[PDB]
């Protein structure tokens, strides 16, 4: 099954894990669990702790007030491992118990029940001038020998793992999104009617987005150009909400419509990261390291409430605009399929 692991620099403490990308089912998050292998003969301190940290680190235009980069732990939980805590009488998982068999009595378990609504692992694309730690929401697992919480943990006997919380496309589709707008003009009460629709609700990354358009112009004005673009919003809400605003792909057609005429064609947008590198602040899916990752997949809020979700929330919608100007926006979902 190929479990992971990490060994403390001194080699005294090591933490095992079954997987590092924990799926989110909208309402529950898979329980982070594993084991820690410790030896009492080198652990006179008599405590081996594990710490799950849901760090949120943010940049943006704070540099002008000096390097005021800040981070706030949106969620922290701890568990005592080497001295078995009496209250943690929770049955082991298959992975934990089979690892215990593999390892013997010198390993101890742990597990964190991450609650829902915690932001998904998301990274914001750094600008070329940024060189510090990449900003965004991330998760991290700590394990350290110690004697109490107040004492600062030594790098010598600490292990740092970075996991990520991941969300996958629903097993069933939504409704075919559609949107239309009717405009009236000072010349006369004669409408300019614009419609737009997409092929399907959920689009996997890299899959083309087919936009179905229809325009009916009964006015004397001429639609000089047709602007169609797909844009990404990232709702940043730590203390008070703020809105991001960033296109990711655009097609500009010089198509027009004569007075009292109709027009209809299908376009094909396809978001991709190749040409969007320069856009600082763009949302990318959470990385496990300084690797390359696709555009941040949409986030599925828990239930219909969607109230008080911290961190970064990403969502997409495609804008159809006519340069008479008239525009309409149409939402869609952009996330990977569930791997087999």
């Amino acid at each position: 099954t190929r479990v992971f692991k990490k060994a403390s620099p001194n080699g005294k403490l090591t933490v095992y894990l079954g997987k590092r990308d924990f799926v989110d089912h909208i309402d529950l998050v898979d329980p982070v669990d594993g084991v820690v292998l410790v030896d009492p003969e080198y652990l006179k301190e008599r405590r081996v702790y594990v710490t799950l940290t849901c760090a949120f680190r943010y940049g943006r235009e704070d540099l002008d007030v000096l390097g005021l980069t800040f981070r706030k732990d949106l969620f922290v939980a701890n568990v005592q491992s080497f001295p078995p805590a009496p209250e943690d009488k929770k049955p082991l998982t298959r992975l934990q118990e089979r690892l215990i068999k593999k390892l013997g009595e010198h390993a101890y378990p742990f597990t964190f029940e991450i609650p829902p609504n915690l932001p998904c692992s998301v990274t914001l694309q750094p600008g070329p001038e940024d060189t510090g730690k990449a900003c965004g929401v991330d998760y991290e697992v700590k394990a350290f020998c110690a004697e109490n919480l107040e004492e600062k943990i030594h790098k010598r006997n600490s292990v740092r793992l970075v996991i990520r919380k991941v969300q996958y496309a629903p097993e069933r589709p939504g409704p075919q999104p559609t949107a239309e707008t009717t405009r009236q003009f000072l010349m006369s009460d004669k409408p300019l009617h614009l419609e737009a629709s997409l092929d399907k609700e959920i689009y996997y990354h890299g899959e083309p987005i087919s936009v179905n358009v229809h325009v009916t112009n009964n006015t004397n004005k001429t639609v000089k150009k047709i602007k169609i673009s797909v844009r990404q919003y990232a709702d940043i809400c730590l203390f008070n909400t703020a809105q991001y605003k960033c296109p990711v792909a655009m097609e500009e057609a010089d198509d027009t419509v004569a007075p009292s005429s109709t027009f209809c064609k299908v376009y094909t947008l396809t978001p991709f990261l190749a040409n969007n590198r320069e856009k600082r602040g763009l949302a990318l899916d959470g990385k496990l390291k300084h690797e390359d990752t696709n555009l941040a997949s949409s986030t599925l809020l828990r239930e219909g409430a969607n109230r008080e979700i911290l961190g970064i929330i990403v969502s997409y919608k495609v804008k159809v605009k006519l340069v008479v100007d008239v525009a309409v926006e149409l939402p869609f979902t952009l996330m990977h399929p569930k791997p087999k």
Partner: antibody
Amino acid sequence: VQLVESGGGLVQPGGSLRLSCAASGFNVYSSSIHWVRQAPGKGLEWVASISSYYGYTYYADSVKGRFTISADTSKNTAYLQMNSLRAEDTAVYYCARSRQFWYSGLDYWGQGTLVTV
Amino acid sequence: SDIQMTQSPSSLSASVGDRVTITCRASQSVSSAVAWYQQKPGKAPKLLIYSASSLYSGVPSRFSGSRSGTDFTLTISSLQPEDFATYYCQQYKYVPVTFGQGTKVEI
């Protein structure tokens, strides 16, 4: 569903030839196209690759700089430009497709035009 | 860097119904990133196994993979008259993707 490949021929050393891999049934943005040759009677060797989603292009050491790979995304066909051909380059040039999210082997293959010296 | 996939045996034979195993060692730890190909004489290869254990769609169940450290194995549960071909071992954890030398199976 399949990959249609064409553009083979014969070119003496110092010549240049162009191969094309016309995809069908998937976009070059959700996929990465790899050119995987096979010398006559020898084993496979990967010679170039393109991943349009990120824009990276990778070349084998034996063809570093000599070759150039590109693909227009409007018609989702990938081209490979070979320059200064040599005798050791004679081979079949199967085109192939690797899932972009994420790599899982070259599941779809072209048909392997020829190249000769 | 280069990762020589020393595949062996470079040739073998077995009757129909006999179980056959092909071994492929990676000159460096490539994790579980290996795939196995079947190339009929003169035609384009075909993918069978990926991730060194996963069975592709369509391929018969007779093909099964396995891993042990840097040693990878492909085993055919019962060789059939249409299984005689050249099989190639491929790793894909590091670019450049490197293929084995192949093992022609003979009647």
